[PDB]
Design a protein around this ligand. Structure first.
Ligand SMILES: [Ca+2]
Length: 104
Protein backbone atom coordinates (compact mmCIF):
# COMPACT_ATOMS: atom_id res chain seq x y z
CA UNK A 1 0.00 0.00 0.00
CA UNK A 2 1.13 3.60 -0.45
CA UNK A 3 1.75 5.82 2.54
CA UNK A 4 1.31 8.82 0.18
CA UNK A 5 -0.23 8.84 -3.32
CA UNK A 6 0.50 11.81 -5.61
CA UNK A 7 -1.52 11.34 -8.81
CA UNK A 8 -0.50 7.87 -9.70
CA UNK A 9 2.86 7.90 -7.89
CA UNK A 10 3.08 5.77 -4.77
CA UNK A 11 5.46 6.55 -1.92
CA UNK A 12 6.27 4.80 1.29
CA UNK A 13 7.28 6.55 4.56
CA UNK A 14 10.90 5.30 3.77
CA UNK A 15 10.82 7.17 0.44
CA UNK A 16 9.75 10.41 2.20
CA UNK A 17 12.30 10.08 5.07
CA UNK A 18 15.13 9.53 2.47
CA UNK A 19 14.06 12.60 0.36
CA UNK A 20 13.65 14.81 3.40
CA UNK A 21 17.08 13.93 4.77
CA UNK A 22 18.78 14.74 1.49
CA UNK A 23 16.85 18.10 1.11
CA UNK A 24 17.47 19.10 4.77
CA UNK A 25 21.26 18.45 4.45
CA UNK A 26 21.40 20.78 1.40
CA UNK A 27 19.49 23.46 3.47
CA UNK A 28 22.10 23.18 6.26
CA UNK A 29 24.93 23.40 3.67
CA UNK A 30 23.42 26.46 2.01
CA UNK A 31 23.41 24.54 -1.31
CA UNK A 32 20.92 23.87 -4.04
CA UNK A 33 20.67 21.57 -7.07
CA UNK A 34 18.73 21.74 -10.27
CA UNK A 35 17.88 24.60 -12.63
CA UNK A 36 15.11 25.69 -10.28
CA UNK A 37 17.41 25.56 -7.25
CA UNK A 38 15.99 23.16 -4.79
CA UNK A 39 15.40 23.12 -1.88
CA UNK A 40 13.78 26.57 -1.77
CA UNK A 41 11.13 28.27 0.30
CA UNK A 42 7.56 27.05 0.09
CA UNK A 43 4.78 29.66 0.72
CA UNK A 44 1.51 28.12 1.96
CA UNK A 45 -0.96 30.22 0.01
CA UNK A 46 -3.21 27.19 -0.60
CA UNK A 47 -3.68 26.95 3.17
CA UNK A 48 -2.86 23.25 3.70
CA UNK A 49 -3.41 22.40 7.33
CA UNK A 50 0.13 21.61 8.31
CA UNK A 51 0.66 20.99 12.02
CA UNK A 52 4.37 22.15 12.03
CA UNK A 53 5.36 25.81 11.80
CA UNK A 54 7.05 27.67 8.88
CA UNK A 55 9.36 28.65 7.35
CA UNK A 56 8.78 25.75 4.91
CA UNK A 57 10.96 24.46 2.11
CA UNK A 58 10.02 22.28 -0.81
CA UNK A 59 12.28 19.55 -2.26
CA UNK A 60 11.47 17.02 -5.04
CA UNK A 61 10.60 13.45 -4.27
CA UNK A 62 11.10 11.19 -7.38
CA UNK A 63 8.83 8.38 -8.37
CA UNK A 64 11.85 6.25 -9.12
CA UNK A 65 13.02 6.24 -5.52
CA UNK A 66 16.28 8.00 -6.42
CA UNK A 67 17.24 11.15 -4.49
CA UNK A 68 16.99 14.28 -6.62
CA UNK A 69 20.33 15.45 -7.95
CA UNK A 70 19.46 17.71 -10.87
CA UNK A 71 17.53 17.19 -14.07
CA UNK A 72 13.79 17.15 -14.11
CA UNK A 73 12.25 17.41 -10.67
CA UNK A 74 8.92 15.89 -11.61
CA UNK A 75 5.78 17.24 -9.98
CA UNK A 76 5.95 15.82 -6.42
CA UNK A 77 7.54 17.47 -3.39
CA UNK A 78 8.20 16.90 0.33
CA UNK A 79 7.80 20.05 2.40
CA UNK A 80 9.85 20.28 5.62
CA UNK A 81 10.44 23.20 8.01
CA UNK A 82 13.41 24.92 9.51
CA UNK A 83 13.55 22.30 12.33
CA UNK A 84 13.61 19.37 9.89
CA UNK A 85 10.02 18.37 10.66
CA UNK A 86 7.96 16.97 7.86
CA UNK A 87 5.02 19.24 7.00
CA UNK A 88 3.50 17.20 4.12
CA UNK A 89 3.76 15.65 0.66
CA UNK A 90 2.30 17.74 -2.17
CA UNK A 91 2.21 17.73 -5.95
CA UNK A 92 1.62 19.88 -8.96
CA UNK A 93 -0.24 16.88 -10.54
CA UNK A 94 -3.92 17.76 -10.93
CA UNK A 95 -3.42 21.49 -10.07
CA UNK A 96 -3.11 24.34 -12.60
CA UNK A 97 0.09 26.20 -13.18
CA UNK A 98 2.46 26.38 -10.25
CA UNK A 99 -0.33 25.51 -7.71
CA UNK A 100 -0.40 22.37 -5.61
CA UNK A 101 -2.75 19.79 -4.17
CA UNK A 102 -1.82 17.47 -1.31
CA UNK A 103 -0.90 13.85 -1.89
CA UNK A 104 -3.41 11.53 -0.17
CA1 LIG B 1 9.65 3.66 -3.39
Amino acid sequence: ACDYTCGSNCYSSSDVSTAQAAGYKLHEDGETVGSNSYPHKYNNYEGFDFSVSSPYYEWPILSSGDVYSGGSPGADRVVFNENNQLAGVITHTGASGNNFVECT
